[PDB]
PDB file of all heavy atoms in Angstrom:
ATOM      1  N   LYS F   7       6.857   1.949  -0.198  1.00 18.60           N
ATOM      2  CA  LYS F   7       7.706   2.042  -1.440  1.00 18.60           C
ATOM      3  C   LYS F   7       7.030   2.909  -2.478  1.00 18.60           C
ATOM      4  O   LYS F   7       5.921   2.673  -2.916  1.00 18.60           O
ATOM      5  CB  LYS F   7       7.913   0.647  -2.050  1.00 18.60           C
ATOM      6  N   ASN F   8       7.727   3.948  -2.859  1.00 16.96           N
ATOM      7  CA  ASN F   8       7.241   4.899  -3.807  1.00 16.96           C
ATOM      8  C   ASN F   8       8.247   4.880  -4.997  1.00 16.96           C
ATOM      9  O   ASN F   8       9.353   5.480  -4.892  1.00 16.96           O
ATOM     10  CB  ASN F   8       7.087   6.328  -3.261  1.00 16.96           C
ATOM     11  CG  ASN F   8       6.604   7.328  -4.351  1.00 16.96           C
ATOM     12  OD1 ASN F   8       6.464   7.011  -5.528  1.00 16.96           O
ATOM     13  ND2 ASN F   8       6.269   8.541  -3.816  1.00 16.96           N
ATOM     14  N   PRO F   9       8.035   4.204  -6.031  1.00 19.97           N
ATOM     15  CA  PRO F   9       8.963   4.135  -7.176  1.00 19.97           C
ATOM     16  C   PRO F   9       9.071   5.441  -7.971  1.00 19.97           C
ATOM     17  O   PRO F   9       9.946   5.522  -8.767  1.00 19.97           O
ATOM     18  CB  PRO F   9       8.412   2.974  -8.074  1.00 19.97           C
ATOM     19  CG  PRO F   9       6.924   3.024  -7.741  1.00 19.97           C
ATOM     20  CD  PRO F   9       6.873   3.319  -6.351  1.00 19.97           C
ATOM     21  N   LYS F  10       8.179   6.377  -7.733  1.00 14.93           N
ATOM     22  CA  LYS F  10       8.167   7.684  -8.438  1.00 14.93           C
ATOM     23  C   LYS F  10       8.210   7.464  -9.966  1.00 14.93           C
ATOM     24  O   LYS F  10       9.110   7.942 -10.603  1.00 14.93           O
ATOM     25  CB  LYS F  10       9.280   8.586  -7.926  1.00 14.93           C
ATOM     26  CG  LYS F  10       9.038   9.018  -6.528  1.00 14.93           C
ATOM     27  CD  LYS F  10       9.919  10.270  -6.172  1.00 14.93           C
ATOM     28  CE  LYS F  10       9.395  11.024  -4.948  1.00 14.93           C
ATOM     29  NZ  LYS F  10       9.726  10.285  -3.659  1.00 14.93           N
ATOM     30  N   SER F  11       7.207   6.787 -10.501  1.00 19.57           N
ATOM     31  CA  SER F  11       7.241   6.319 -11.890  1.00 19.57           C
ATOM     32  C   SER F  11       6.318   7.072 -12.821  1.00 19.57           C
ATOM     33  O   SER F  11       5.970   6.633 -13.911  1.00 19.57           O
ATOM     34  CB  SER F  11       6.891   4.861 -11.915  1.00 19.57           C
ATOM     35  OG  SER F  11       5.797   4.542 -11.094  1.00 19.57           O
ATOM     36  N   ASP F  12       5.829   8.303 -12.458  1.00 15.11           N
ATOM     37  CA  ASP F  12       4.974   9.127 -13.232  1.00 15.11           C
ATOM     38  C   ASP F  12       5.689   9.391 -14.567  1.00 15.11           C
ATOM     39  O   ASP F  12       6.833   9.847 -14.663  1.00 15.11           O
ATOM     40  CB  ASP F  12       4.766  10.510 -12.534  1.00 15.11           C
ATOM     41  CG  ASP F  12       3.872  10.342 -11.309  1.00 15.11           C
ATOM     42  OD1 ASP F  12       3.447   9.202 -11.009  1.00 15.11           O
ATOM     43  OD2 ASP F  12       3.684  11.393 -10.679  1.00 15.11           O
ATOM     44  N   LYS F  13       4.962   9.088 -15.669  1.00 14.31           N
ATOM     45  CA  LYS F  13       5.408   9.271 -16.989  1.00 14.31           C
ATOM     46  C   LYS F  13       5.495  10.682 -17.454  1.00 14.31           C
ATOM     47  O   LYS F  13       6.006  10.963 -18.514  1.00 14.31           O
ATOM     48  CB  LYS F  13       4.629   8.380 -17.946  1.00 14.31           C
ATOM     49  CG  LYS F  13       4.609   6.910 -17.650  1.00 14.31           C
ATOM     50  CD  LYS F  13       4.024   6.061 -18.800  1.00 14.31           C
ATOM     51  CE  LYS F  13       4.542   4.639 -18.757  1.00 14.31           C
ATOM     52  NZ  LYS F  13       3.926   3.907 -17.614  1.00 14.31           N
ATOM     53  N   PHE F  14       4.940  11.599 -16.733  1.00 14.20           N
ATOM     54  CA  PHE F  14       4.983  12.981 -17.058  1.00 14.20           C
ATOM     55  C   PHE F  14       4.791  13.766 -15.745  1.00 14.20           C
ATOM     56  O   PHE F  14       4.330  13.259 -14.729  1.00 14.20           O
ATOM     57  CB  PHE F  14       3.898  13.405 -18.063  1.00 14.20           C
ATOM     58  CG  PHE F  14       2.544  12.770 -17.836  1.00 14.20           C
ATOM     59  CD1 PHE F  14       1.655  13.420 -16.952  1.00 14.20           C
ATOM     60  CD2 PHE F  14       2.209  11.633 -18.471  1.00 14.20           C
ATOM     61  CE1 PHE F  14       0.376  12.753 -16.699  1.00 14.20           C
ATOM     62  CE2 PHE F  14       0.982  11.051 -18.257  1.00 14.20           C
ATOM     63  CZ  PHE F  14       0.031  11.539 -17.374  1.00 14.20           C
ATOM     64  N   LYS F  15       5.118  15.026 -15.741  1.00 12.84           N
ATOM     65  CA  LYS F  15       5.159  15.840 -14.498  1.00 12.84           C
ATOM     66  C   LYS F  15       3.704  16.302 -14.110  1.00 12.84           C
ATOM     67  O   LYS F  15       3.065  16.952 -14.918  1.00 12.84           O
ATOM     68  CB  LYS F  15       6.018  17.080 -14.661  1.00 12.84           C
ATOM     69  N   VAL F  16       3.204  15.763 -12.983  1.00  9.80           N
ATOM     70  CA  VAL F  16       1.907  16.037 -12.498  1.00  9.80           C
ATOM     71  C   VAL F  16       2.060  17.007 -11.296  1.00  9.80           C
ATOM     72  O   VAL F  16       2.897  16.837 -10.435  1.00  9.80           O
ATOM     73  CB  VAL F  16       1.204  14.749 -12.069  1.00  9.80           C
ATOM     74  CG1 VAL F  16      -0.130  15.061 -11.338  1.00  9.80           C
ATOM     75  CG2 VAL F  16       0.984  13.930 -13.305  1.00  9.80           C
ATOM     76  N   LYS F  17       1.181  18.014 -11.173  1.00 10.22           N
ATOM     77  CA  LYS F  17       1.248  18.957 -10.129  1.00 10.22           C
ATOM     78  C   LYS F  17       0.216  18.594  -9.055  1.00 10.22           C
ATOM     79  O   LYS F  17       0.552  17.892  -8.104  1.00 10.22           O
ATOM     80  CB  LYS F  17       1.072  20.404 -10.599  1.00 10.22           C
ATOM     81  CG  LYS F  17       2.296  20.836 -11.537  1.00 10.22           C
ATOM     82  CD  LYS F  17       1.930  22.152 -12.217  1.00 10.22           C
ATOM     83  CE  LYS F  17       2.444  23.386 -11.465  1.00 10.22           C
ATOM     84  NZ  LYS F  17       3.944  23.401 -11.327  1.00 10.22           N
ATOM     85  N   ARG F  18      -0.947  19.089  -9.237  1.00  9.15           N
ATOM     86  CA  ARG F  18      -2.024  18.885  -8.229  1.00  9.15           C
ATOM     87  C   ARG F  18      -3.300  18.697  -8.838  1.00  9.15           C
ATOM     88  O   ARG F  18      -3.485  18.958 -10.128  1.00  9.15           O
ATOM     89  CB  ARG F  18      -2.024  19.940  -7.207  1.00  9.15           C
ATOM     90  CG  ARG F  18      -2.647  21.302  -7.667  1.00  9.15           C
ATOM     91  CD  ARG F  18      -1.880  21.816  -8.922  1.00  9.15           C
ATOM     92  NE  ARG F  18      -2.228  23.219  -9.232  1.00  9.15           N
ATOM     93  N   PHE F  19      -4.309  18.267  -8.171  1.00  8.30           N
ATOM     94  CA  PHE F  19      -5.712  18.302  -8.625  1.00  8.30           C
ATOM     95  C   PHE F  19      -6.078  19.760  -9.001  1.00  8.30           C
ATOM     96  O   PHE F  19      -5.698  20.684  -8.243  1.00  8.30           O
ATOM     97  CB  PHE F  19      -6.632  17.839  -7.477  1.00  8.30           C
ATOM     98  CG  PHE F  19      -6.766  16.389  -7.362  1.00  8.30           C
ATOM     99  CD1 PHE F  19      -6.530  15.735  -6.096  1.00  8.30           C
ATOM    100  CD2 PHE F  19      -7.178  15.589  -8.403  1.00  8.30           C
ATOM    101  CE1 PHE F  19      -6.703  14.340  -5.928  1.00  8.30           C
ATOM    102  CE2 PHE F  19      -7.389  14.235  -8.289  1.00  8.30           C
ATOM    103  CZ  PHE F  19      -7.107  13.658  -7.059  1.00  8.30           C
ATOM    104  N   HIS F  20      -6.757  19.905 -10.113  1.00  6.27           N
ATOM    105  CA  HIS F  20      -7.050  21.236 -10.579  1.00  6.27           C
ATOM    106  C   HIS F  20      -8.503  21.593 -10.458  1.00  6.27           C
ATOM    107  O   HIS F  20      -8.866  22.589  -9.918  1.00  6.27           O
ATOM    108  CB  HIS F  20      -6.580  21.396 -12.036  1.00  6.27           C
ATOM    109  CG  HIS F  20      -6.657  22.879 -12.545  1.00  6.27           C
ATOM    110  ND1 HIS F  20      -7.757  23.388 -13.191  1.00  6.27           N
ATOM    111  CD2 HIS F  20      -5.800  23.838 -12.459  1.00  6.27           C
ATOM    112  CE1 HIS F  20      -7.536  24.618 -13.503  1.00  6.27           C
ATOM    113  NE2 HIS F  20      -6.317  24.959 -13.075  1.00  6.27           N
ATOM    114  N   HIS F  21      -9.385  20.717 -10.917  1.00  6.80           N
ATOM    115  CA  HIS F  21     -10.817  20.952 -10.735  1.00  6.80           C
ATOM    116  C   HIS F  21     -11.563  19.655 -10.993  1.00  6.80           C
ATOM    117  O   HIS F  21     -11.052  18.692 -11.530  1.00  6.80           O
ATOM    118  CB  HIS F  21     -11.350  22.104 -11.695  1.00  6.80           C
ATOM    119  CG  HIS F  21     -11.282  21.751 -13.163  1.00  6.80           C
ATOM    120  ND1 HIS F  21     -10.210  22.184 -13.943  1.00  6.80           N
ATOM    121  CD2 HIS F  21     -12.183  21.205 -14.014  1.00  6.80           C
ATOM    122  CE1 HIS F  21     -10.433  21.817 -15.155  1.00  6.80           C
ATOM    123  NE2 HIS F  21     -11.607  21.206 -15.178  1.00  6.80           N
ATOM    124  N   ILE F  22     -12.800  19.624 -10.509  1.00  6.88           N
ATOM    125  CA  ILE F  22     -13.705  18.525 -10.789  1.00  6.88           C
ATOM    126  C   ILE F  22     -14.869  19.178 -11.593  1.00  6.88           C
ATOM    127  O   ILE F  22     -15.408  20.186 -11.188  1.00  6.88           O
ATOM    128  CB  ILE F  22     -14.217  17.905  -9.462  1.00  6.88           C
ATOM    129  CG1 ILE F  22     -13.121  17.265  -8.765  1.00  6.88           C
ATOM    130  CG2 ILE F  22     -15.391  16.960  -9.746  1.00  6.88           C
ATOM    131  CD1 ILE F  22     -12.364  16.163  -9.582  1.00  6.88           C
ATOM    132  N   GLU F  23     -15.248  18.545 -12.725  1.00  4.33           N
ATOM    133  CA  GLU F  23     -16.377  18.991 -13.527  1.00  4.33           C
ATOM    134  C   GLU F  23     -17.632  18.109 -13.406  1.00  4.33           C
ATOM    135  O   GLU F  23     -17.443  16.896 -13.789  1.00  4.33           O
ATOM    136  CB  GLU F  23     -15.983  19.242 -14.985  1.00  4.33           C
ATOM    137  CG  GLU F  23     -17.243  19.838 -15.801  1.00  4.33           C
ATOM    138  CD  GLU F  23     -16.839  20.115 -17.220  1.00  4.33           C
ATOM    139  OE1 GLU F  23     -15.824  19.599 -17.753  1.00  4.33           O
ATOM    140  OE2 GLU F  23     -17.612  20.906 -17.900  1.00  4.33           O
ATOM    141  N   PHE F  24     -18.697  18.597 -13.005  1.00  2.94           N
ATOM    142  CA  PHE F  24     -19.980  17.922 -13.015  1.00  2.94           C
ATOM    143  C   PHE F  24     -20.666  18.206 -14.331  1.00  2.94           C
ATOM    144  O   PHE F  24     -20.768  19.389 -14.763  1.00  2.94           O
ATOM    145  CB  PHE F  24     -20.848  18.374 -11.866  1.00  2.94           C
ATOM    146  CG  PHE F  24     -20.369  17.922 -10.532  1.00  2.94           C
ATOM    147  CD1 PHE F  24     -19.356  18.625  -9.908  1.00  2.94           C
ATOM    148  CD2 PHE F  24     -20.856  16.810  -9.918  1.00  2.94           C
ATOM    149  CE1 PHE F  24     -18.889  18.275  -8.663  1.00  2.94           C
ATOM    150  CE2 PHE F  24     -20.361  16.467  -8.608  1.00  2.94           C
ATOM    151  CZ  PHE F  24     -19.420  17.190  -8.015  1.00  2.94           C
ATOM    152  N   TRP F  25     -21.238  17.248 -14.960  1.00  4.52           N
ATOM    153  CA  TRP F  25     -22.127  17.403 -16.106  1.00  4.52           C
ATOM    154  C   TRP F  25     -23.533  17.342 -15.580  1.00  4.52           C
ATOM    155  O   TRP F  25     -23.907  16.358 -14.861  1.00  4.52           O
ATOM    156  CB  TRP F  25     -21.868  16.407 -17.210  1.00  4.52           C
ATOM    157  CG  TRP F  25     -20.925  16.952 -18.170  1.00  4.52           C
ATOM    158  CD1 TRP F  25     -20.286  18.206 -18.098  1.00  4.52           C
ATOM    159  CD2 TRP F  25     -20.471  16.379 -19.368  1.00  4.52           C
ATOM    160  NE1 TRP F  25     -19.473  18.389 -19.188  1.00  4.52           N
ATOM    161  CE2 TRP F  25     -19.522  17.262 -19.991  1.00  4.52           C
ATOM    162  CE3 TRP F  25     -20.691  15.164 -19.995  1.00  4.52           C
ATOM    163  CZ2 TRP F  25     -18.868  17.008 -21.240  1.00  4.52           C
ATOM    164  CZ3 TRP F  25     -20.026  14.812 -21.204  1.00  4.52           C
ATOM    165  CH2 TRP F  25     -19.132  15.718 -21.840  1.00  4.52           C
ATOM    166  N   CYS F  26     -24.287  18.360 -15.928  1.00  4.81           N
ATOM    167  CA  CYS F  26     -25.651  18.653 -15.316  1.00  4.81           C
ATOM    168  C   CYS F  26     -26.618  18.756 -16.339  1.00  4.81           C
ATOM    169  O   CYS F  26     -26.299  18.938 -17.570  1.00  4.81           O
ATOM    170  CB  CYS F  26     -25.561  19.978 -14.403  1.00  4.81           C
ATOM    171  SG  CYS F  26     -24.233  20.043 -13.228  1.00  4.81           S
ATOM    172  N   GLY F  27     -27.909  18.740 -15.977  1.00  6.96           N
ATOM    173  CA  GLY F  27     -29.003  19.167 -16.845  1.00  6.96           C
ATOM    174  C   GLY F  27     -29.207  20.628 -16.818  1.00  6.96           C
ATOM    175  O   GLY F  27     -29.489  21.287 -17.794  1.00  6.96           O
ATOM    176  N   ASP F  28     -29.092  21.211 -15.545  1.00  5.36           N
ATOM    177  CA  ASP F  28     -29.191  22.645 -15.288  1.00  5.36           C
ATOM    178  C   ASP F  28     -28.063  22.958 -14.428  1.00  5.36           C
ATOM    179  O   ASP F  28     -28.113  22.652 -13.194  1.00  5.36           O
ATOM    180  CB  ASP F  28     -30.549  23.058 -14.779  1.00  5.36           C
ATOM    181  CG  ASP F  28     -30.659  24.514 -14.585  1.00  5.36           C
ATOM    182  OD1 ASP F  28     -30.982  25.183 -15.536  1.00  5.36           O
ATOM    183  OD2 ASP F  28     -30.361  25.102 -13.469  1.00  5.36           O
ATOM    184  N   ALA F  29     -27.064  23.690 -14.901  1.00  5.18           N
ATOM    185  CA  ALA F  29     -25.818  24.023 -14.114  1.00  5.18           C
ATOM    186  C   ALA F  29     -26.158  24.991 -12.999  1.00  5.18           C
ATOM    187  O   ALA F  29     -25.651  24.861 -11.895  1.00  5.18           O
ATOM    188  CB  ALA F  29     -24.796  24.550 -15.073  1.00  5.18           C
ATOM    189  N   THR F  30     -27.025  25.896 -13.233  1.00  5.03           N
ATOM    190  CA  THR F  30     -27.434  26.953 -12.332  1.00  5.03           C
ATOM    191  C   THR F  30     -27.920  26.358 -10.957  1.00  5.03           C
ATOM    192  O   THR F  30     -27.482  26.712  -9.933  1.00  5.03           O
ATOM    193  CB  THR F  30     -28.440  27.910 -12.927  1.00  5.03           C
ATOM    194  OG1 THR F  30     -27.827  28.719 -13.979  1.00  5.03           O
ATOM    195  CG2 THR F  30     -29.018  28.812 -11.854  1.00  5.03           C
ATOM    196  N   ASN F  31     -28.875  25.535 -11.067  1.00  2.00           N
ATOM    197  CA  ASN F  31     -29.481  25.017  -9.837  1.00  2.00           C
ATOM    198  C   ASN F  31     -28.522  24.084  -9.037  1.00  2.00           C
ATOM    199  O   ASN F  31     -28.523  24.087  -7.813  1.00  2.00           O
ATOM    200  CB  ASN F  31     -30.828  24.247 -10.198  1.00  2.00           C
ATOM    201  CG  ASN F  31     -31.987  25.237 -10.279  1.00  2.00           C
ATOM    202  OD1 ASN F  31     -32.554  25.530  -9.254  1.00  2.00           O
ATOM    203  ND2 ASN F  31     -32.104  25.819 -11.414  1.00  2.00           N
TER     204      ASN F  31
END
């Protein structure tokens, strides 16, 4: 059962952001 109840239009996963101490390494 998929009620399709999204309250707004969602497309796809866009990105994942890691918070780092040193982004380069």
Side-chain angles (χ1 to χ4, degrees), residues 8-14 16-17 19-31:
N8 182 350
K10 291 199 162 76
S11 44
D12 291 358
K13 301 192 156 74
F14 43 85
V16 170
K17 292 168 94 64
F19 278 128
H20 190 268
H21 64 266
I22 295 299
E23 182 177 18
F24 293 80
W25 268 2
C26 309
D28 184 84
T30 290
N31 275 270

